[PDB]
Design a protein around this ligand. Structure first.
Ligand code: FES
Ligand code: FE
Lengths: 436, 158
């Protein structure tokens, strides 16, 4: 169908308990997501440790717009279009740098302060009796009003539509606090490199998989079954190779995944693992445990280490894993192309073993060379191809559907419930159609 | 009694084993404590404090090899195939007394699956030693030109 300027057709794609395949396959819908969905939502753009000093910047892209995220001279984070006020040149090339006291366009050298405002124009008398002063360009670079941070995690929203930051995320931000609290100094810094894994599928398949407890015992059987076989008849408390530790539980009974639980939020956020874990001696690092107690005391340390949220989804473009200090950023490219960038943090003040474990995890699970990553990409590409079939054009999201869930709010539910996915497409429809 | 040509012959044959699916014989070329290392960034310092694409000990190499035999390795349906093209290995270090040898070998690596194909270029560093009269690898380091770029799935062994 022609979805442009056709919100009724968009609404018809999303029912309470299933969604239409065009969400995954339609390039037109992808284009409209850039204009509406991704422009009307809050999206992660970077971490403060990547731009700690005045003049530091990183480049990024959100909803098809090229951005600069920069530290201004007042210590604040500002976000703006990487698009000169004159004829649209990127002001900065490459992924990061420091621009000192001003951006300088590399085509004709108009300059801009680090808040985006126009600073100087060469040969400015050439505009003396022109209407330049009446145009938006005279202000400088287009700046984003909607720029917020939580515990160093920076998010932006392009448009004026949709919930503001605090309402958008609610208490889901607590997962970020837990990851930073695991530093004995309460601070995270980006470290260890970025695994950049191109996926030939729609971004939605990656995000759904983060809440998908019915896939691991199927899609990871060859990887996990192999791992289990090379760790046979061992004491349960004997330290395991991390590959065995991480792969073997993919084959757990369904009851294990059901019991783990999911919490869902308005606007599609979620986390898996709703329980508190008791901190045991299994694979403990005494110097780290000591440093935690020294900083926080016994009771608060147990609270911090006891949070057991296996993953958290900051819909639509970020997921984090608290206890391992790994994050994954979703970079949609087209209806059938998504880049996943997987980053890690050092826990400031922790012994080096902690970053060793986190960087090992990042390699094992999230590299383009990871067999677990191959497993899930294969499943996504299988759906990306299969969904072109006709006849049944619907993607079933019926598992554990109950209309009581339509009230929204925070909901804690069984771990195999497809609720987080249903919730996400309710948010998607709203954010799509509100600006059409 | 090790010659420079035996060192070169070793690296050439190692790639030939990989291209002919002789993975068990390949794995036996490593010492039991060796690592197979594909760094993530150029001039990466080590495989302990920085992420890599691969930093595989004997257990991880065996896991990956055995998984390729599984009827439910869905990501290898149909199986991928690879090809290595090598520039002649260059001997950087020849220490017979210390039983230590280091070679540097440029490569073009192709991996295909069905009608899809990708290629990668880079340089190998092989650390070789003699154990029980036979050459073995104590480290294979694979420096890809574009290690830190956006890569699709790489499923065989470079
Ligand atoms: S495009 Fe920037 S100064 Fe001309
Ligand atoms: Fe998975």
């Amino acid at each position: 169908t022609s979805y442009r300027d056709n919100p009724d057709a968009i609404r018809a794609l999303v029912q309470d308990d299933r969604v239409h395949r065009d969400l995954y396959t339609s390039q037109e819908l992808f284009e409209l997501e850039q204009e509406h969905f991704f422009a009307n939502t809050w999206n992660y753009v970077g971490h403060e440790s990547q731009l700690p000093k005045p003049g530091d910047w990183i480049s990024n892209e959100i909803a098809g717009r090229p951005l600069i995220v920069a530290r201004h001279s007042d210590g604040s984070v500002r976000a703006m279009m990487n698009r000169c006020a004159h004829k649209g040149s990127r002001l900065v090339n490459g992924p990061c740098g420091n621009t000192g006291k001003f951006f300088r366009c590399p085509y004709h050298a108009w300059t801009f302060k680090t808040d985006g405002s126009l600073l100087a124009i060469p040969l400015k008398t050439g505009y003396e009796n022109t209407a330049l002063h009446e145009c938006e360009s005279a202000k400088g670079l287009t700046t984003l009003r909607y720029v917020r941070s939580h515990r160093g995690f920076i998010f932006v929203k392009i448009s004026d539509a949709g919930p503001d930051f605090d309402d958008y995320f609610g208490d889901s931000l607590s997962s970020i606090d837990n990851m930073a609290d695991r530093s004995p100094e309460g601070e995270l810094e980006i470290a260890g490199g970025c695994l950049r894994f191109m996926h030939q599928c729609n971004w939605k398949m990656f995000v759904e998989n983060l809440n998908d407890t019915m896939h691991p015992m199927v899609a990871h059987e060859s990887s996990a079954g192999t791992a289990k076989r090379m760790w046979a008849d061992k004491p349960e408390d004997e330290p395991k190779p991390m590959a065995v530790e991480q792969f073997a539980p993919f084959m757990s009974d369904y009851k294990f995944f059901e019991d783990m639980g999911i919490r869902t939020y308005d606007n599609g956020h979620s986390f898996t693992g709703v329980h508190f874990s008791i901190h045991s001696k299994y694979k403990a690092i005494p110097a780290y445990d000591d440093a935690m107690k020294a900083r926080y005391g016994e009771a608060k340390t147990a609270q911090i280490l006891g949070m057991a949220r296996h993953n958290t989804v900051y819909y639509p473009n970020l997921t984090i894993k608290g206890a391992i200090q790994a994050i994954r950023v979703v970079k949609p490219i087209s209806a059938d192309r998504t880049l996943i960038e997987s980053w890690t943090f050092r826990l400031k003040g922790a012994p080096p073993e902690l970053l060793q474990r986190t960087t090992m995890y990042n390699r094992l699970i999230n590299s383009p060379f990871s067999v677990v990553g191959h497993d899930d990409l294969q499943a996504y590409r299988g759906m990306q191809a299969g969904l072109h079939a006709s006849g049944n054009e619907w993607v079933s999201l019926h598992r554990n559907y109950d209309p009581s869930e339509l009230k929204g709010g925070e909901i804690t539910t069984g771990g195999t419930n497809e609720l987080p996915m249903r919730n996400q497409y309710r948010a998607w429809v709203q954010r799509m159609t509100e600006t059409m | 009694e090790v010659t420079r040509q035996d060192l070169i012959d070793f690296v050439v044959n190692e790639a030939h084993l990989l291209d002919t699916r002789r993975y068990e014989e390949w794995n036996a070329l490593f010492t039991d404590d060796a690592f197979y290392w594909v760094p993530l960034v150029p001039d990466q310092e080590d495989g302990l404090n920085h992420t890599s694409h691969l930093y595989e000990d004997k257990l991880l190499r065996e896991l990956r090899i055995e998984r390729l035999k599984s009827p439910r390795a869905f990501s290898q349906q149909p199986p991928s195939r690879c090809h290595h093209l090598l520039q002649v290995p260059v001997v950087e270090q020849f220490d017979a007394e210390g039983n230590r040898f280091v070679l540097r070998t440029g490569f073009h690596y192709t991996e295909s699956q069905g009608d899809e194909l990708q290629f990668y270029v880079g340089t190998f560093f092989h650390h070789l030693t003699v154990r029980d009269g036979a050459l073995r690898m104590t480290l294979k380091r694979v420096n890809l030109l574009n290690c830190d770029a956006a890569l699709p799935a790489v499923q065989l062994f470079i």
